Amino acid sequence: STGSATTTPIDSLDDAYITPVQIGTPAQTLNLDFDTGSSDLWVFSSETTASEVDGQTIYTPSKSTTAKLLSGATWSISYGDGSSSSGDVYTDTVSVGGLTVTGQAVESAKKVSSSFTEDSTIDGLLGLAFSTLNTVSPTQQKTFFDNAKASLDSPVFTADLGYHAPGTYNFGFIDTTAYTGSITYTAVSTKQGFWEWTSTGYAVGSGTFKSTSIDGIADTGTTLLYLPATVVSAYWAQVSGAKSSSSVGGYVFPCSATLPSFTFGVGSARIVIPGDYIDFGPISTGSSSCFGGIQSSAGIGINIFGDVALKAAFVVFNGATTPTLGFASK
Ligand SMILES: O[C@H]1[C@H](NCc2ccccc2)[C@H]2CO[C@H](O2)[C@@H]1Sc1ccccc1
Numbered sequence: 301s302t303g304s305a306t307t308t309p310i311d312s313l314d315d316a317y318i319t320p321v322q323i324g325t326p327a328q329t330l331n332l333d334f335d336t337g338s339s340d341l342w343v344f345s346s347e348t349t350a351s352e353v354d355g356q357t358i359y360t361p362s363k364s365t366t367a368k369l370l371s372g373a374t375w376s377i378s379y380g381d382g383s384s385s386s387g388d389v390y391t392d393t394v395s396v397g398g399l400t401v402t403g404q405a406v407e408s409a410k411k412v413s414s415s416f417t418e419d420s421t422i423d424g425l426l427g428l429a430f431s432t433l434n435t436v437s438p439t440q441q442k443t444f445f446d447n448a449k450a451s452l453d454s455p456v457f458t459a460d461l462g463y464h465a466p467g468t469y470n471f472g473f474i475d476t477t478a479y480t481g482s483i484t485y486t487a488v489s490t491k492q493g494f495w496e497w498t499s500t501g502y503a504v505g506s507g508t509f510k511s512t513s514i515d516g517i518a519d520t521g522t523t524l525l526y527l528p529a530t531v532v533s534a535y536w537a538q539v540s541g542a543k544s545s546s547s548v549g550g551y552v553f554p555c556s557a558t559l560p561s562f563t564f565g566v567g568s569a570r571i572v573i574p575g576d577y578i579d580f581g582p583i584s585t586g587s588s589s590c591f592g593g594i595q596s597s598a599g600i601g602i603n604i605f606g607d608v609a610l611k612a613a614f615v616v617f618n619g620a621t622t623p624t625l626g627f628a629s630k
Pocket of ligand 1 (some may be wrong): 381524
């Protein structure tokens, strides 16, 4: 089997991407944030505190004839931005772009933090990291991809995120028309539960490539590219007026600037992120100071190849017995 679904930026800055997901019987369609950096499928629901729902589409398990409460199971998760959610668990039928999983753990939110409430465009998350990170207690549950894997034509899914444009998540197959050149595969460590890999280095604009090992995770659920302080300093040093701002919380730059591209290595291959991918607009409405899309990972503890990097590539998440990651230009 295979599945294929269109993924759409939630706003003009590509802050995140939502993908329609069918849940229950009859189908309830929610727009979820596919996140290769976590492993919980959770949703706004009829059980969510009313004051914490503001525009989201909710899952109502009482109206799904295939929904079953998972007895005694609860979940609770926190993300790097300090956001959080929690609740109970149902099993139900879940479909993504024609690919169906029965008995999928659907984590129903009772509580969500303010940042989720304030974002009316995201109805929940669909985790695509390794199931070892799933937070359901006392019995850990599997991801959508893990549940679907054996039935897929090939045990893979691919991410093709658009710059200011729609893109595609495919499951079970590789669309050879969706990229140029070849796909370069690179080793993955799953020891932290992530799609963790090692970039071979970087370049800034037309500058010479620096060969250096950068350990990081391919994470569709993070907006920006988070890299070592040395690398990030080297990038913004090429933007006149750019400065790291403590009050703002990272590198900002004059909105009138022309941003240089940023290249990262995948083995011997090179992925080029165009300069305008790195522009995340005014820090506040009307400001001429703009926020940078490449930031330091120093206060994170891990480098993150988030959407800024991934949307410059066609990315294969290969879930074979030994998983690997593939990158192609497009
Ligand atoms: O990019 C953010 C994500 N929010 C993206 C988003 C922004 C605006 C509107 C919708 C969605 C979530 C998931 O993880 C963090 O918060 C990461 S930044 C991070 C920091 C420390 C550790 C790991 C990641």
